[PDB]
Amino acid sequence: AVKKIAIFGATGQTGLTTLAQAVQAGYEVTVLVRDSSRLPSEGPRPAHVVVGDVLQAADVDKTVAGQDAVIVLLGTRNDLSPTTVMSEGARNIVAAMKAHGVDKVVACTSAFLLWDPTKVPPRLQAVTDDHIRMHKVLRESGLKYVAVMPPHIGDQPLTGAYTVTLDGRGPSRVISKHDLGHFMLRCLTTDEYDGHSTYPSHQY
Numbered sequence: 001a002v003k004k005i006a007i008f009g010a011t012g013q014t015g016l017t018t019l020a021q022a023v024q025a026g027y028e029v030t031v032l033v034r035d036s037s038r039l040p041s042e043g044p045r046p047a048h049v050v051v052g053d054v055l056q057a058a059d060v061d062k063t064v065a066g067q068d069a070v071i072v073l074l075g076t077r078n079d080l081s082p083t084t085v086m087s088e089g090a091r092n093i094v095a096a097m098k099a100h101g102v103d104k105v106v107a108c109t110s111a112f113l114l115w116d117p118t119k120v121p122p123r124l125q126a127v128t129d130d131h132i133r134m135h136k137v138l139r140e141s142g143l144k145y146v147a148v149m150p151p152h153i154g155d156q157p158l159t160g161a162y163t164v165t166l167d168g169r170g171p172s173r174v175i176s177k178h179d180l181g182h183f184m185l186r187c188l189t190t191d192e193y194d195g196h197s198t199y200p201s202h203q204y
């Protein structure tokens with residue numbers, strides 16, 4: 001079974017609850033954070049903290065070393081400018097996983113990768129472009145890759161009752177951040193989603 005995991009993006013909206021749920025479930029969690037000040041000071045906390053940047057290959061390498069699996073929840077917070085942080089970060093993660101023999105990566109992009117490209121809101125296209133680039137890096141890596149492609153991420157409660165749609169869009173346009181984190185961790189316990197795109201959604 002999967003015991004040691006690295007989480008990238010652990011200080012973000014979904015990352016923080018994914019981190020808390022992972023520790024609750026008994027995982028030995030390692031995180032790469034740009035600033036440990038953005039990690040919780042009480043409650044569930046990671047077993048190992050690396051402070052550094054996903055754009056520094058040395059920082060990614062020491063985060064991935066020794067893990068059983070990797071969770072990717074990188075993002076740009078509210079910045080919708082053009083970016084390559086997620087795809088370049090993914091390149092470094094793939095290289096580190098290959099060097100260290102880690103084969104399982106669960107990575108969040110967006111449901112827009114499942115949309116008709118004429119329907120993607122132009123204001124979100126620059127971020128979506130790098131989600132596309134990141135997905136390409138991960139799909140071409142040959143690793144056991146679960147492509148998590150959520151719709152809008154909300155702040156509704158944890159339910160564990162969401163629908164998981166494979167290789168297409170699902171019947172709701174929202175997933176709570178807690179349920180998205182729950183699903184990321186579920187993907188560590190099964191291989192049934194490897195090589196698929198997954199769309200978690202629910203009605204709250």
Ligand SMILES: NC(=O)c1ccc[n+]([C@@H]2O[C@H](COP(=O)([O-])OP(=O)(O)OC[C@H]3O[C@@H](n4cnc5c(N)ncnc54)[C@H](OP(=O)(O)O)[C@@H]3O)[C@@H](O)[C@H]2O)c1
Binds near residue numbers: 010111
């Ligand atoms: N908002 C939505 O409705 C929605 C819908 C579909 C998909 N998505 C996608 O889902 C993913 C996660 O969304 P989210 O809101 O949970 O993430 P988020 O709140 O934007 O947090 C992003 C995470 O990435 C980390 N990060 C950014 N640059 C980094 C770097 N250079 N080195 C190391 N870490 C770095 C941030 O660390 P710091 O604490 O240092 O900033 C933070 O932990 C994103 O890719 C987003 O585009 C979002």
Ligand SMILES: O=C(O)c1ccc(-c2nc(-c3ccccc3Cl)c3sccn23)cc1
Binds near residue numbers: 127
């Ligand atoms: O299928 C859906 O209904 C759906 C999918 C994705 C999104 C989405 N929202 C954001 C966003 C919005 C405001 C501030 C920050 C961010 Cl990051 C981004 S960036 C890439 C995708 N998205 C919305 C709806």
